[PDB]
Amino acid sequence: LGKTLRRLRQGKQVSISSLADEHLSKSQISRFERGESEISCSRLLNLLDKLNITIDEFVSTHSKTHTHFFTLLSRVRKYYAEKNVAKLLKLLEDYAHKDYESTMIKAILSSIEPTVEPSEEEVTRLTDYLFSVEQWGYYEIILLGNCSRFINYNTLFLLTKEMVTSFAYSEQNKTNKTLVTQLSINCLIISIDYSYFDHSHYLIEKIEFLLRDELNFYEKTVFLYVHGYYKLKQGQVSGKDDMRQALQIFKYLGEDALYYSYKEHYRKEV
Amino acid sequence: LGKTLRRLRQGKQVSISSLLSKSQISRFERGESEISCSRLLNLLDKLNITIDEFVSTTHFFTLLSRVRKYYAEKNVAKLLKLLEDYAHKDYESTMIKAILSSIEPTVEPSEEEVTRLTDYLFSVEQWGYYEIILLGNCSRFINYNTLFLLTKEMVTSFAYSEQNKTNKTLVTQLSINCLIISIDYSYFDHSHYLIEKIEFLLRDELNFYEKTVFLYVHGYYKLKQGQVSGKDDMRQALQIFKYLGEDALYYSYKEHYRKEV
């Protein structure tokens, strides 16, 4: 890490002297950059703050290394694209000691090989975990998103309510907020399908709130369609206009797969 | 940091045990022992929390948060007091003046303040959030030639992570911003360069907002290169703003369209 600090600091034409204070001497900083000494994370954060770099930014330039969970996701990712049932199968044996992860691997794997599904008991251990969490992070959001097909609708709806009211984001990083918005829309789709208009109404209000003062045009475009679909299912002719506008957006942006997929929904349900 | 670790762990119903020793884990949490970032990252990893996420739960961030609060209120007196408070910080106060300018036109950074900032941006080997936000907010006070040179430096030497694409998204927006001025000023070599960079940045992303503004601005390019279909592209981008109820973007680009087309 000292190597990376050195590179970033020199890269900003900043002296070691200007970084030194009562917490770390010039000597301690040099010894750290050279790897002769280690410093505390807190003292590193102080240095970074002086360089106007936050520790999450520092970590990504230090190396392409990622967490266990992101490593899991990356593996699963490329296998799902290539339809390789085979190595998802022993990816699943590789993770057997990790209950929520393997439950999630089974959920994903079922989308290309339905013979494997998480058991009701496995899913229930996961939903119990999810209900038990006080703040939803990337982990809980991704677990819920990828296991949703195996959660009963009412538990899914209740889990969604928990997630939208308990996720964490900051002004500098809306990664989790964008995900929460996408999964809320996903629940809204199911709620409309099952004609739970109580649940639909709640979700529409939440989604509108989540999209306020944001860019997020992909979610706004999908929400234009889905809300229009909700409107249609309750006799507003405008709903079809909304859906046709969303189709045009996909079309205009050259998003052919999305265009095709939503136009298929339109021709079927409308 | 020991405090924030505790909360994150415990709000997951995770025991100290099943996570260093129980003692030192416990001991870091109570803010008694300092641990390395290496061991902190290891702990977060065990907790299935990213460092990006951990941070989300910092001088520059504090400044931005205050700016955001006052600007949203359009509160000129409060932004002037913020400017006072940061006057001894050169790039930060220049940026505050640039932002203030948009709601109080009498306030502007001086040529010399802007030059110190662009000298600094030019000197940085790798662009991060700080540099990107400074450029983006000070751009209306930077002459086009300097703006293009810095944009080229930024595009070719910024960093981002797969987990947090914040920087990549901002760089895309600022590249498009530069592109529309390059086309205004008929730097078509510049425009050609930026178009390739933007197309690369957009590849395998959603980023519908950037794609919508790019559809308009690339359409603008096409119109100036003699392709009449560019008009179609620009009108379609406007329709997208309209359909999504994006008033500001719609009326602003419609304005640009009426003057240029």
């Binding site: 996701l73 990712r77 994903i108 996903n186 | 395998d204």
Partner: peptide
């Protein structure tokens, strides 16, 4: 990458 829909998050 693209979510159409869930789908693989985040694929």
């Amino acid at each position: 990458x693209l979510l159409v829909t869930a789908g693989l998050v985040l694929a």
